[PDB]
Structures are given as C-alpha cells and as structure tokens.
Amino acid sequence: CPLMVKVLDAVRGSPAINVAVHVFRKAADDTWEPFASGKTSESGELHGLTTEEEFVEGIYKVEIDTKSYWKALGISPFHEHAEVVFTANDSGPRRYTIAALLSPYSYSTTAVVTNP
Amino acid sequence: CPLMVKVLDAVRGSPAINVAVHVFRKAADDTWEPFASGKTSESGELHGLTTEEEFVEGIYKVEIDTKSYWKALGISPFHEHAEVVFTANDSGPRRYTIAALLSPYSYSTTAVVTN
Amino acid sequence: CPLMVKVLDAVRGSPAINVAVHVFRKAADDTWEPFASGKTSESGELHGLTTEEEFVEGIYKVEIDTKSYWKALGISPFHEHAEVVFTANDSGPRRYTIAALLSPYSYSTTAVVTN
Amino acid sequence: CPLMVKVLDAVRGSPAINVAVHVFRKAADDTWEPFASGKTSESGELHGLTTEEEFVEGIYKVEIDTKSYWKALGISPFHEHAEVVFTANDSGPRRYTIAALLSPYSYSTTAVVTNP
Numbered sequence: 001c002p003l004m005v006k007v008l009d010a011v012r013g014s015p016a017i018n019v020a021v022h023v024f025r026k027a028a029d030d031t032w033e034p035f036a037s038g039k040t041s042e043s044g045e046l047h048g049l050t051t052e053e054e055f056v057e058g059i060y061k062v063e064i065d066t067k068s069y070w071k072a073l074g075i076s077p078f079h080e081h082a083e084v085v086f087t088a089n090d091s092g093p094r095r096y097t098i099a100a101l102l103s104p105y106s107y108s109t110t111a112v113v114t115n116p
Numbered sequence: 117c118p119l120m121v122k123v124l125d126a127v128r129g130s131p132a133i134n135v136a137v138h139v140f141r142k143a144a145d146d147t148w149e150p151f152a153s154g155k156t157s158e159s160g161e162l163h164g165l166t167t168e169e170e171f172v173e174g175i176y177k178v179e180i181d182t183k184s185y186w187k188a189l190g191i192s193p194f195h196e197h198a199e200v201v202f203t204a205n206d207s208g209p210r211r212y213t214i215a216a217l218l219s220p221y222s223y224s225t226t227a228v229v230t231n
Numbered sequence: 232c233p234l235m236v237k238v239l240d241a242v243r244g245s246p247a248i249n250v251a252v253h254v255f256r257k258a259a260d261d262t263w264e265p266f267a268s269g270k271t272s273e274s275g276e277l278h279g280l281t282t283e284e285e286f287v288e289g290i291y292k293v294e295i296d297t298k299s300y301w302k303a304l305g306i307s308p309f310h311e312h313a314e315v316v317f318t319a320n321d322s323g324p325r326r327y328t329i330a331a332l333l334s335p336y337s338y339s340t341t342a343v344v345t346n
Numbered sequence: 347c348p349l350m351v352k353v354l355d356a357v358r359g360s361p362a363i364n365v366a367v368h369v370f371r372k373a374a375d376d377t378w379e380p381f382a383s384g385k386t387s388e389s390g391e392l393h394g395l396t397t398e399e400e401f402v403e404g405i406y407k408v409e410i411d412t413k414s415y416w417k418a419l420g421i422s423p424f425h426e427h428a429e430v431v432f433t434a435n436d437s438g439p440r441r442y443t444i445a446a447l448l449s450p451y452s453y454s455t456t457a458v459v460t461n462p
C-alpha cells in the first residue's frame with residue numbers, strides 16, 4: 001500500500017464514508033491516464049489502490065469526488081471535487097497518505113510521505 | 117488598527133456575521149485580562165479593537181464564540197469556542213490579521229502579519 | 232469583478248505575492264479552455280480577472296502555481312499546483328472569492344460567495 | 347482509549363513527533379484542572395491519555411504545545427499553542443479523536459467522534 005487516501009467530514013465530525021476516488025497518471029503525451037479508483041470505507045480510508053511495482057515515478061492526480069458525497073447527503077456543495085496533483089517516487093519509492101477534510105464550501109488536504 | 121479579526125463560514129461559504137469575539141492579554145500573574153471585544157460585521161470582520169499605543173508586546177488570546185454562531189443557525193457544534201493564542205512582537209511587521217475558518221467540528225486559523 | 236482570488240502563505244504568515252493563477256472554463260467537449268490569468272498582488276490578491284458579462288454559469292477551474300512559489304523561497308513542495316474546481320451558479324450570490332492557504336505539503340481553500 | 351490526539355506537520359509532510367499535549371477539565375469552581383498529559387509518538391499519535399471510567403462528562407481543553415514543537419526544530423512560530431475546547435460525553439460515552447495539522451503561522455483542527 002504505497003498510496004492511501006483518507007477523508008474526513010468536518011460537518012458531522014466523522015470519517016467521510018463511500019467517497020469515490022479516481023487516480024490518474026500523466027502519460028507521455030501529457031494527457032491524464034486512468035490509473036486506479038475506489039471508494040472510502042466506513043473508516044474513511046481507501047486502501048489497495050495500487051502496488052509498489054505499478055506505482056512508478058510520475059505525476060499523479062488524486063480526484064476526490066466531494067460533490068457526489070455531499071449530494072448523496074442532500075447538500076449542495078460549492079466544489080466539483082477536490083484535486084491533489086503531485087510528483088511521486090522521484091527520489092525512489094515512498095509511501096503516500098493523501099488526507100482531506102471536507103466542508104460544503106471548503107476543504108483542506110495534506111500529504112504524509114514516508115520512506116519504507 | 118494593529119489587530120483585525122476575520123471569521124468565515126465553511127458550511128455556507130460566507131462571512132461569519134455577528135460573531136462575538138473577545139481579546140485577552142496575559143497578565144503578570146498568568147491570568148487572562150479582558151483587553152478588547154466586539155461582534156463581526158457583515159463582512160465577517162472586526163476592526164477597531166485596539167490602537168498602536170495600547171497594543172504592546174505580550175501574549176494575547178482571541179476567543180471566538182463559535183458555539184453561539186452555530187446554534188443560531190440550528191447546527192450542532194463540537195467546540196465551546198475557538199481560541200487563538202499568540203505573542204505580539206515589535207520586531208516583526210506591524211499589522212496582525214487573525215483569520216478563522218469555521219466548520220461545525222473543525223476550524224482553521226492563520227495569521228497574516230504585514231507592514 | 233465577480234471573481235477574485237486570494238492566496239496566503241501559512242509558513243511565513245503573509246500574503247502569497249507574485250503567484251501565477253490561471254482560470255479555465257469547461258468547454259462542451261469536456262476540455263479546459265483558458266479563460267483568465269494573472270499574478271497575485273502585494274496583498275496576495277488577484278482582481279480584474281473577468282466581468283459580469285463574461286462570467287456565465289458553467290464549471291471553472293482555478294489553478295494556482297504553488298510549486299513555483301515555494302521553489303522561489305527555497306522550499307521543497309509536494310504539489311504541482313493547487314486546483315479549485317467549482318460551478319458558477321446565477322441562483323446564488325453574485326461575487327465569488329476563492330481563497331487558498333498554502334503550506335509546503337498542504338493547502339486549504341474556501342469560497343466566500345456574497346451579494 | 348476514549349480520547350486520542352493526532353498531530354501532522356504541513357511543512358515536512360510527516361507526523362508531528364514529540365509534541366507535548368496537556369488536557370484540562372473544567373472544575374466546579376470554573377477553573378481548569380489538570381486532567382492528563384503526554385506526547386505524540388513516531389506516528390504523531392498520542393494514546394492512553396485516559397480511561398472510560400475517568401473520562402466523565404465535562405468541558406475539556408486539549409492544549410497542543412505547537413510553539414515548543416516548532417522551536418525544537420529551530421523555527422519561530424506565531425502561536426503559543428493550539429487549544430481545543432469541547433464538551434464531552436454529554437449524550438453518554440463517546441470516543442474522540444482530536445486531529446491537528448500544523449504550520450508555523452497556521453493550524454487546523456478537527457474532531458472525529460464515534461459511538462462505541
């Protein structure tokens with residue numbers, strides 16, 4: 001698990017459950033290629049997106065589908081999604097946790113990057 | 117003046133209006149002495165709290181009554197209030213903006229310190 | 232105008248000055264079309280991006296070049312940029328402020344939407 | 347473990363390690379009584395502050411000593427500490443995670459409240 005996503009809900013004070021997440025990797029032609037996807041569990045965590053072998057050096061985009069989340073709760077939010085774009089593994093393999101804290105008109109994201 | 121407070125609402129995407137704010141200065145006996153207070157404006161801002169002459173170096177606490185704000189909107193909040201505790205330092209820039217972004221179970225705060 | 236962008240630096244406690252900002256509008260073929268751009272001022276603000284007439288309902292992306300900002304300060308950042316993607320809606324209030332608070336490995340963004 | 351504190355560093359993209367945390371509870375005379383303290387581990391987490399029996403209804407203040415943290419890293423921060431004040435267990439026993447994300451001139455905090 002070199003890539004994990006965690007999502008929290010700042011309105012309910014809870015994990016954000018059943019949040020869809022799509023990961024893209026920039027290809028040689030500079031387009032965004034689909035790389036992995038999944039949804040957060042009851043704990044707000046999404047594990048198993050990729051493997052150490054598959055998660056090579058590259059520019060990755062983690063799209064967290066916040067609008068679908070809020071609308072599934074009957075709330076009309078501001079943003080379409082939260083996007084997190086970063087270069088990964090440029091100094092060799094690392095483990096990445098992308099965390100996001102959601103409100104209807106605001107979000108924050110941080111990364112925790114560790115060396116295994 | 118040298119101290120402004122700005123409060124935003126992350127749920128509604130708006131200034132947080134009519135929020136009570138209290139500023140305290142730390143006394144020699146380590147207690148918190150009332151210093152200044154007011155309510156945020158329609159723009160979520162509270163100006164005119166103090167003056168350059170009165171705002172000396174020291175430790176200050178800005179207490180924002182977030183609980184009343186959320187209850188007035190019919191929303192159940194986690195915190196009793198938000199508190200921002202910091203040292204005023206003459207070495208650094210002269211004007212302090214303390215900004216707070218409010219959610220029912222979360223808040224963020226930053227300082228914008230300029231000349 | 233109807234759209235302002237404000238960028239703050241959480242490390243130095245200051246406006247984020249001379250940060251490049253690009254605004255895109257989503258086209259019918261789902262691609263991102265350049266719409267407006269500029270660099271933040273000494274106050275961390277970028278005004279005059281668009282007008283009421285040009286800023287129609289639709290999906291917009293605000294891309295903030297955070298990587299260059301941090302590198303110019305000699306600090307190693309995590310993100311390639313910060314992106315804020317949202318729908319402009321005529322039903323809601325008329326003026327949009329997109330604010331971003333920057334750290335090397337984190338950012339926060341909020342929308343202040345007023346009449 | 348009805349009360350856990352987690353602290354992250356937004357400058358380094360890491361857990362905030364060795365952060366001192368002091369918890370107070372408001373007493374009948376309206377003063378802040380020392381309740382528990384500890385420091386964050388290598389994972390940025392502080393476990394074992396209290397027990398279900400001891401963690402009764404009350405108003406609690408969690409003081410995270412952010413200034414000592416930044417200064418131990420040779421950085422002069424703005425805030426003295428981050429304070430989190432909340433009523434706990436007013437609708438019966440809950441589990442609380444208090445999370446904080448730190449920068450030198452800014453911090454954010456959120457709560458995750460679960461029912462065991």
Ligand SMILES: *B(O)c1ccc(/C=C/c2ccc(B(O)O)cc2Cl)c(Cl)c1
Pocket residue numbers: 108122124213215216217223224225226228237328330331332339340341343453454
């Ligand atoms: B925490 O993640 C966080 C706190 C505050 C703010 C925003 C501050 C701000 C927004 C807008 C204006 B304005 O319209 O002139 C001024 C300020 Cl100081 C954010 Cl984004 C995040």
